[PDB]
Amino acid sequence: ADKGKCGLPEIFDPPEELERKVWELARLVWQSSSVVFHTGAGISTASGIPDFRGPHGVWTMEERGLAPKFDTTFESARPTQTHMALVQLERVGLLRFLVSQNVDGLHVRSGFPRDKLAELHGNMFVEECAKCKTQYVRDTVVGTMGLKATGRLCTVACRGELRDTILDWEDSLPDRDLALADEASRNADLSITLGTSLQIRPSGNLPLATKRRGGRLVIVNLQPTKHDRHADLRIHGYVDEVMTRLMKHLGLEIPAWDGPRVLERALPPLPRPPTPKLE
Template identity: 55%
Template sequence: MSCNYAEGLSPYENKGVLGVAERFESHEVVEEKCRTLADWILQSRHVVVHTGAGISTAAGIPDFRSPKGVWTLEKQGLKPQINISFNDATPTKTHMALKKLADIGYIHYIVSQNIDGLHLKTGICRELIAELHGNMFVEKCNTCEKQFVRNSATTSVGQRLLGTMCRGYRLNGRPCRGKLQDTILDWEDNLPELDLNMADYHSHAADLSICLGSTLQIVPSGNLPVATKKSGGRLVIVNLQPTKQDKKADLLINSFVDDVFVQVMKHLQLEIPEYSYENDPTKKINDVIEWTIHPVYVKDAKKLYDTFSKKPKKRKSDEDVLIKNEKKKQNDSSEFNSYKIDEKSASENVEELKECTANISENAEQVISQASAECI
């Protein structure tokens, strides 16, 4: 349950802006905007979707900062009335729509802040998702760093040891024998490097970023969607509350995320698939399912980044500026010195000039005298 997850985190004061009033647009306005979003999805080269807690509320999992969110109520000394367990929660229409769109290549990557495992339960490929804050249904070896799918949600938070051994093998075929730990981040924990790299590469390569159910207050997660703007891409935000990045959005939709994606899929003439127990890796009790980001995925994402992202110019430091100015002074001084006149040479040149002038004057007088004689 998200309440138990929140209670398992270390004490932390700055949980962002809480309890801001929600906004709802009319059905007609939302439908028109959904048509625009569907058109943009079809027109775009690389679509990246950023998901927050708001896409899981329809599954019975409370969010954190809405008027009825976990941390908003916590501040009032209350707890959410509806709070389903992570084990019992199933993917929403939005989760299943994203899985369908990813399968047919309409969206190309998902960056999620959610730890509820609902994306995993859709059966999505690991190559297509970064989980920046961890996953309740994923554990990681502290030795080989491989990740494995769990059949039940972990009760541990903060990347703590779970008391179980790694199920992976070394290159020589021997068991790893490392110890497994949860993947859930606590406050101030570093984000998982490979997930963050994948999210960063795809976010910069995107020409359409779609933010769903997040106020985008947490960094760096909340800043990744705007990377597309540096390359002239579009930013779409679907959320009931105002977000940190609203002013940068090309399209804002204030509506329930599920309602939006029902309309979007309708305009795309696609059906939203039903959740399938058989395709849910958390239900495959007898299988060892790895959930590790393969180095090839990172390499391919880096190629996308290099190909499509617009790299900002490197800002010169104060030290760089001082060095450049000093070099310029030295060059100017050298250039000035090269034009200095040697005093001795100058004196000799003046004497030669006087002698030359005297000769010219003497010759001129002779020519004038000769010309006068001829005239007489």
Template identity: 55%
Template sequence: MECDGVRRGTMAARRNAAVAGEARRRAAVAVLEEMGPAQLGRGEGSNRKTATGLENLKKSREMSLGYAEKLSYREDVGTVGMPEKFDSPKLLQGKIEELAVMVQKSKHLVVFTGAGISTSSGIPDFRGPKGVWTLQRAGKGVPDASLPFHRAAPTLTHMALVELERAGLLKFVISQNVDSLHLRSGFPREKLAELHGNSFKEVCPCCKTEYLRDFEIETIGLKDTPRRCTDKNCGARLKDTVLDWEDALPPEEMNSAEEQCRTADLVLCLGTSLQITPACNMPLLSIKNGGKVAIVNLQATPKDKKASLVIHGFVDKVIAGVMCILSLRIPPYIRTDFIQLLLRHTVKKKCVRWTLRVTSVHGMRAPLSFLRSIEVSFPDRSDMKPVVLMEQPFSLQRYIGDCNVPRPICAN
């Protein structure tokens, strides 16, 4: 005889060390100014280390390519390989203070993000000196990836945006990135427009239900995936959400993004070259209604002349300085995984065998390796001693005679 039991739970695990203390945060600007280029993550131009206070960014030289390898080849990708520009320390500090005042006075702040905010997590940009498209144009091809796309963690900038939203200062984020780091950071989905899609998200074309995965979707270009909608009244085949070159922007995301830019009195552009149309023109919608545009990027952009403030510096450094001036603490990134526990037992010749499998909520083919051991005990059977199991699938066999099958209690 056989029976199955399924239990779901959540596990929150801090990835390496937590963020530095509040006193260290308040000294962020001074500390960051003392750090040279080798210590700081670049904007849209590199993937070097950044002083984020999160030790999980120490592997930032590793690269996550993800969907860059899946994009259709295109010769004309705009200007690539532009030189990086750096404001002097004194000028940079003055601009950081000016930006902090602009953010504080803003009634409707919208942030527009590009690849430059994710480089310090190990994800390369596209147009920088070592960007994907820059290397391809030079005949060097796509660089080797040593960090899986799904292992990239939100950066200091991602987490700062979460805190700005919680503080009521940030109303909406428009992103051109497909790395899912905004959602992983905990930023509210209803206040986020992902213009180019999400490599970790599927959508049902019929009922519009979204499925956020902890693995990268196999396809791009709005194609069918191997999975179906789990709604019992639907069951349609799911589609990926990432655009290829010829795909139009999703109307729902584009409409909300344009509406937010028209409403904004300040659009802050972070780590974007502002070259991809039609997305690059959205921030300028705020100017038509009396708003302002501020740009933080390591390279010049076609929209610089229309911006009220242009900062050439590391995005993480600029945002850390702004948060310090505003006396806002940047929260640590805490990863939350939803897990599924599958407990099964079989009875044969007065013996019972229990098997416990720990998987992600996406099914048996997605086991989770971080659970190293479990302790099994039987409160209702004093003759059965507790035991520690050390290897998945966790399996245990006991003789029960003519008694009913006892219920084990498992703990990690």
């Protein structure tokens, strides 16, 4: 399995540069009509789920003969401030689409509308009827990885075989989620990447599609990423800190998490602050 470059050194922007880049991110969100976010495992590290390629990442530790460490189970994990900031950005109509490589189920469990989300690598809580393609979002992890039989049968009125949604190394991306992600990415005038190294094709390349027809690209990550050279703005810090400052400049609160909830469909936007005068 090609696991790419693992355990690169972290970069930390010093405070004054950090504060000034988040103001510039604010400016781009205000100026943009179609904003798409791309998330990876870096946005879940602050709730106790290790990443893949970070200092204590899954791959990084296995390369050194060590184990990844979980400070939580998938079921007891709480969405981060970043997760909840993405919920609110979608509710006030500032986020058009969310593209995620994470199988951790937290975006769905955060209350984020599934019809605005592409889970490119599947969802550990989601099993899907082989025949009728009906998905079930379960309250516990389904039990298998690699699109195998879970043991359970479809209940739609069918008795179809339910399989997990976790892609194995050689498994192709779900076409609907990839097509929705690719469509949102081409149409975006701003793509913001959060805690991904962007080292996986084609997930990691979707943000680049935004640069075609003059879109802007922002990369928020602690480590270098595959596409650092193509970004108009790279922010080297904790995504929780970036997103709490961004939300403060936008005049938005980060909503409370009520515990695990499934929203199928986005609502019309809630009221949002009026926009600053720019330049």
